[PDB]
Amino acid sequence: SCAYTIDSYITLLTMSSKKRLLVEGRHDRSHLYQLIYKFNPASKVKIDTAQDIKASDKAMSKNNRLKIETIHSKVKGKDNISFLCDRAFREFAFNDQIEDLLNSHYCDDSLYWTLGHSLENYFFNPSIIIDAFQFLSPSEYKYKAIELFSELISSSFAVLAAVSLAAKDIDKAGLPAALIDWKDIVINDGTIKLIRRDSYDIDSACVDSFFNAFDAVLPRVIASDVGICSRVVRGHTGILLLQKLFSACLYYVGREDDALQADSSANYFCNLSELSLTTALAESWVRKIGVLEDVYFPDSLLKNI
Amino acid sequence: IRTISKIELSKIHNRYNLTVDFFNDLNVIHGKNGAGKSTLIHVIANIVNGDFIRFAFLIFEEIKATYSDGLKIVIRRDKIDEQSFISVTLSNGKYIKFAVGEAMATVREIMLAMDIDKFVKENELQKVRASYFPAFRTMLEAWSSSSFYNRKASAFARELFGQFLPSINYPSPMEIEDRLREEIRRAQLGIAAYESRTFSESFVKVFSALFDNGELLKEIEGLAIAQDSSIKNGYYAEYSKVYEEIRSLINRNVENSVSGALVVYRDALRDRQDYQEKAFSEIDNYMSSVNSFLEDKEMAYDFYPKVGLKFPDGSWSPIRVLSSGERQLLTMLYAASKMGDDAIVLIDQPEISLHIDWQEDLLKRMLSQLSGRQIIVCTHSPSIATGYEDFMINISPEFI
Amino acid sequence: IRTISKIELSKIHNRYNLTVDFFNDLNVIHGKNGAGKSTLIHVIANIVNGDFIRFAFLIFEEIKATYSDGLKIVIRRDKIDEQSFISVTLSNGKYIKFAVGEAMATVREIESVKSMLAMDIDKFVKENELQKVRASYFPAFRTMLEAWSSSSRSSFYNRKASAFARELFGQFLPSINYPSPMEIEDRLREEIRRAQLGIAAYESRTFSESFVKVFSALFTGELLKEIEGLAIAQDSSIKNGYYAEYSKVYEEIRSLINRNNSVSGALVVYRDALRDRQDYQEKAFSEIDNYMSSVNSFLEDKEMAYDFDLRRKYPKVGLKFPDGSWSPIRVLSSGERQLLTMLYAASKMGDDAIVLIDQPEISLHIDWQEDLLKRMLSQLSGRQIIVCTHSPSIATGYEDFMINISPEFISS
Ligand SMILES: Nc1ncnc2c1ncn2[C@@H]1O[C@H](COP(=O)(O)OP(=O)(O)OP(=O)(O)O)[C@@H](O)[C@H]1O
Ligand SMILES: Nc1ncnc2c1ncn2[C@@H]1O[C@H](COP(=O)(O)OP(=O)(O)OP(=O)(O)O)[C@@H](O)[C@H]1O
């Protein structure tokens, strides 16, 4: 491919005089560009992505974080570059309750971490999710679906965190993406219960291990603080889980008027592209910064560049 | 509009086959050495310009070109009776076959070309042209400075790199200087006509206020300060003096007609400023795009109109004193400008002599001018293609 | 030897100054656009070649050049009574001075026997030994330039191309000294012929010395296998295309031995003679094989190699394909030709020079840019390489040798 190596990129850092930021993926680049352009629409910061940097090592080829750590280690002390990684489950304690050992943005010589699991954890404020889903909706029963969703979102985060922890315990990270479907979700009086459907394309062993982990982790997540709980949800997992939860609540509250119309709208929402959801969440997240004190962002990172 | 969407090449140079699928906004072609990037650009430029007489100099079997609207052109090179025949087949079924030797004879002379352009003009194949930026822009610009420039440079470059090379028609910096001067003269004449209009209009505007019954002076003061300190004015730039006379006579002298006349004067000042801004909109946007790259100089105009580079000491220099990379930046930004000719921009190696801080912003500043044109670049540099990895096209031809 | 060490510019085009300190092995010069990189390379190429008559075409005030051995050259452009004068002052007090109008008239007449000014300049640079080291100048426009040359040159006879390039880019541009691939091919043929003649002289000397040592010393199982391996290695070399009959002679000697002390000495001096001939074959073809190994590390579907044949008497030099076909070096593309010239200029076969390359990344893929400087330095010529580049893929891994250029603008 046509991309820089680690050494070539380090040389580019020596040659270029711009203020630079290095992130993991291209989606992180688009979201951070919106974040930077809100404070300074004429800002000249150039954001590079570690996804577009070739690595000679086979193991380091698809480990974006290791690429960032390697680059940061070899130019440790430069002034024009900042680094951002995903915290993942680092600095979290699972001693029967979710505990955050930092509760702030990590900083180590222009290397910064997202406050949550990844960059997408900044979108998990309820106001942002509400505004974004209302704006990006089939526009059939939006007001009642949003009102129900706003009721469910407080307790649903415990479910999402339990799903993510159950996925990482059995190391099947991509399993909840294809296992759980929005139809499996049931909307109760503020709660949800992902019934173990008897029929699944995946083998029963993985499904059984996932539900055993989910059941064994759910009371621990319940006892944890909601604010800490909303940050440990995996970034890619959470987006789809919210998409399904909204498809389920929309069909649940709109089927009585017209079951077919509600099902079509619910499937339409479920068939929406992930990129569309991330862009809508990013726009809502940008708009809510500075309006609500409960919306977070890497302030130290923005200050540094 | 009409954009290239597919190019298929079969046995070109009797050596390889290649099918390329394009985007409609930006395409960044990349590949190894000798992968046929430049030949792909030449084929696209010759097809889009309607210059099919170039295809007598290319050895191939079949070239298929698909546009955006569904129009398909099939070009074949058959060999019958030890004679080569070029067959061009449209999607309408109309076709034209011409001999290779006759085309070669017309090349040695520089009738058949008249038939070709009649066929092209009949089927509207020259709806959109193509601006071809070669890989040897710098020495060609230096050679031509020592549409007639297009013809002479095309002849010299086809003398060097073969007759299949398309007609070189990108805007040279001298052409850029001439077109900037023409747009400045047109903007001045438009300002003159607008002033003559608003001159005759404001008389009846005042006459209307004579039959009808503080901060306005401050707003007029701000408008007069902005216009007096405006580079677009060189003549009658004493609005501050007449504003001071007006405010002195106001403080010396409440009739509603006086307030209405103040409203008319404020509207006339802001309306003249608005037309003066909209007349120089394209030139100021192009010079703002250029001056976002240059570090210790600033491209600007002054008034007879002078177009050059201001340095921080205030001295002026012509465009000829620029380096190679800065001149290439000027040409590549002018081709994507709105005042540039509406075409398909084909650039071969845009990263030549450009610093990486400019390579990162070249495609961004070309797309931010909202030209709506299709841009196809072939590059070896990863800093040109950063931020636009969704549009990268990797070509790996099948060699036989 | 003598290498450049410091260039101090003062008011080039009456607006900016520069001061660059160099290294003696490799200088990767980078900077912003319009910094004055090509002007710096032109100044170095005019000073090192001793072509001071170029400096009547540059607007400046003072240019100082310091070499490694301490020789300092000071060029000053003055304007006395509206008449401009160039004064070149060395460090030993020797100096010359001429008028700018005379130089312009001389250059225009050259466009139309050397002049008084040309003879005086050549006498001044010859009597002061100012031309010990040449300067190979690779221009930024070389890709179209060789295409222009191939439609109508060498490192010593390049008058027409330099005249055309000075016509296009002004008269300050230095002479185009970079070797054409035809010059490289001719030099390769001459070096191969010299290596063959040295091999013949070594064969005669080793034959006489081995006969003397054999006849004087005259009055086992592992040795035969080792001699067999040496003869197999001698037979399996391209360099022995004129004689490939080592195994037959070994088999005759082995058959004479095997049917029936004093023979052990003959065996060990035979092994020593074979080893000495093999080592002289490596030594005599060392630079050619090293240069071709440097070039063939880049080429993918072909390899540059040499060929001998007893029926003809002309060593064939050109490209060899894996299917056995042979093609000359002119069927290379532009980028591969750039690799060939830029690797010959840093080789030992090239002339002692200071390799000035402007934009080495022209027409090169990103895989070749990462290895160009490593393969230029791996030949161990001891040259001083000065490259003006915008590409981080050329300069990667050599960030200790990178020199940033930031001229200081003066206001007046
Ligand atoms: N008659 C010919 N004209 C042009 N190219 C030819 C011809 N015959 C074969 N070729 C091959 O076509 C390729 C050159 O085409 P082109 O200039 O489009 O390539 P490229 O990938 O842009 O080259 P580069 O990276 O060297 O600029 C090479 O592989 C060359 O060997
Ligand atoms: N005749 C001239 N008069 C004034 N300034 C000149 C003249 N010629 C060149 N310059 C200036 O000198 C610089 C050009 O020199 P040079 O080509 O060495 O620069 P560079 O940094 O190598 O450029 P590039 O980006 O093309 O590689 C520019 O700043 C240009 O404005």
C38 lines ligand 2 (CB under 6 A): yes
Of residues C396, C343, C294, the one with CA closest to residue B382: C396
* Phi, psi values for residue B238, rounded to 5°: -115, 45
Give Cα A112 distance to the centre of its chain: 17
Q: Which of A137, A74, A136 is nearest to A111 (CA)?
A: A74
Interior CA angle at B48 toward B116 and B139, to 5°? Answer: 105
Between CA B69 and CA C125 the distance in angstroms is 70
Our CA-based measurement puts residue B391 at a distance from the nearest CA of chain A, in whole angstroms, of: 13
Nearest Cα neighbor of B102 from B91, B117, B116 is: B116
DSSP state of A292: B
Q: List the residue whose alpha carbon is closest to atom 7 of ligand 2.
A: B321
Q: What's the farthest any 2 CA atoms get from each other in chain B?
A: 100
Contact A237, A177 (CB under 8 A): yes
d(CA C96, CA C79): 16
Q: Which two structure tokens, joined as six digits, stand for C131?
A: 């031309």
The dihedrals phi and psi of A301, each to the nearest 5 degrees, come to -65, -45
Whole-angstrom Cα distance, residue C300 to residue A299? 51
- For residue C187 the two structure tokens come to 């030099």
DSSP string, A22-54: EESSHHHHHHHHHHHHHH-TT---EEEEGGGB-
CB A113 within 8 A of CB A104: no
Burial zone of B271 (CB within 10 Å; 0-12 exposed, 13-18 middle, 19+ buried): middle
Of C306, C276, C321, which Cα lies nearest the Cα of C191?
A: C306
Cβ-based neighbour number of residue B62 at 10 Å: 16
Give yes or no for A12 touching B (CB within 8 A): yes
Max intra-chain CA distance, chain A: 64
Task: Please check whether residue B395 touches C, CB under 8 A.
Answer: no
Amino acid at B214: G
- How many CB atoms within 10 Å of residue C332? 19
Lookup result for tokens 């001389």: C106
Which residues does A162 contact at the CB level (< 8 Å), separation at least 6? A214, A217, A218, A221
Distance (Å) from the alpha carbon of A208 to chain C's nearest alpha carbon: 49
Burial A176-185 (b: 16+ CB within 10 A, else e): beebbebbbb
In the structure encoding, which two tokens stand for residue C157, read together?
């006879």
Name the residue type at position B226: A
Distance in angstroms (rounded) separating the CA atoms of residues A11 and C394: 9
Q: Is A90 in the B-facing interface, judged by CB distances under 8 Å?
A: no
Ligand 1 and B32: CB distance under 6 A: no
| C202 within 8 A of C280, measured Cβ to Cβ | yes
Angstroms from C35 CA to nearest CA on chain A: 14
Q: B301 in helix, strand or coil?
A: strand
A198: Cβ–Cβ under 8 A, 6 or more apart, which residues? none
Which residues on B lie below 8 Å from A29 (Cβ)? 387
CA B17 – ligand 1 centroid, Å: 13
The two tokens of residue A96 are 């029967």
Discontinuities in chain C with C to N beyond 2.5 Å fall right after 112, 152, 219, 260
Closest to B341 measured CA to CA, from B371, B368, B301: B371
Q: Which of B41, A50, B30 is nearest to C367 (CA)?
A: B30
Closest CA to A136 of A38, A239, A31: A239
Which residues of chain A make contact with B360, given a CB cutoff of 8 A?
18, 46
B291 in C contact zone (CB under 8 Å)? no
Residue written as token pair 């998990």? A124
Cα Rg, chain A, nearest whole Å: 21
Distance CA A296, CA C6 (A): 54
Helix, strand or coil, per DSSP, at residue A106: coil
Ligand 2 mutation target, pool B298, B309, B319, B323, most atoms within 8 A of CB: B323
Contacts of C239 (CB under 8 A, 6+ apart): C281, C285, C308
C307 by DSSP, 3-state: which?
A: strand
Scored b (16 or more CB within 10 A) or e, A274-302 reads eeebbbbbbbbbbebbeeeeebbbbeebb
- Read off the amino acid at residue C52: F
Are the beta carbons of C321 and C302 closer than 8 angstroms?
A: yes
Q: Report d(CA A121, CA B143) in Å as an integer.
A: 59
Which atom of ligand 2 approaches the CA of B296 most closely?
29
Beta bridge partners of C7: C20, C65
Put simply, the answer to whether A18 touches B360 (Cβ < 8 Å) is yes
Phi-psi region of C366 (alpha: psi -120 to 50; beta: other; left: phi over 0): alpha
Experimental technique behind these coordinates: cryo-EM
Q: What are phi and psi of A49, to 5 degrees?
A: -115, 130
CB-based contact C295:C343 (threshold 8 Å)? yes
Per the CB < 8 A criterion, the answer to whether C185 and C317 are in contact is yes
Residues followed by a break in chain A (C to N exceeding 2.5 Å) are none
Q: Which of B7, B9, B30, B38 maximizes ligand 1 atoms within 8 Å of its Cβ, making it the mutation to test the pocket?
A: B38
- What's the length of chain B? 400
Give the residue on B whose Cα is nearest the Cα of A33: B387
The one-character DSSP state at A130 is: H
Ligand with smallest separation from the Cα of C16: 2
Residues forming a β-bridge with B65: B7, B73
Determine the distance separating the centroid of ligand 1 and the alpha carbon of C339, expressed in angstroms.
16
Backbone dihedral angles phi then psi of residue C409, each to the nearest 5 degrees: -80, 130
d(CA B103, CA B163): 11
**Site of tokens 């270029």:** A16
For a mutational test of ligand 2's pocket, the pick from C39, C42, C358, i.e. the residue with the most ligand atoms closer than 8 A to its C-beta, is C39
C-alpha–C-alpha distance, residues B163 and A38, integer Å: 53
Helices (H), chain A: 6-15, 26-39, 58-61, 64-74, 126-135, 142-169, 175-179, 204-223, 226-229, 235-254, 259-270, 274-288, 299-304
Measured from the CB, is residue C409 less than 6 Å from ligand 2?
no
CA dihedral C242, C247, C250, C256 (to 10 degrees): -120
Residue A162: closest CA among A120, A211, A217? A217
Which protein residue's CA is at the shortest distance from atom 13 of ligand 1? B34
What is the total residue count of chain A?
A: 305
Compute the distance between CA of residue B365 and CA of residue A14 in angstroms, rounded to an integer: 24
Q: What does the angle CA C226 – CA C230 – CA C234 come to, to the nearest 5 degrees?
A: 170
CA C345 to CA C179: how far, in whole Å?
Answer: 7
Instruction: Give, rounded to a whole angstrom, the gap between the first and last alpha carbons of chain C.
Output: 41
The β-bridge relationship of strands B26-30 and B375-378 is parallel
Residue nearest to atom 27 of ligand 1 (CA): C363
Instruction: For A30, name the nearest residue in chain B, comparing CA atoms only.
Output: B387
Which residue owns the Cα nearest ligand 2 atom 15?
Answer: C36
DSSP annotation string for A174-216: THHHHH--TTT--B-SS-B-----S--SS-HHHHHHHHHHHHH
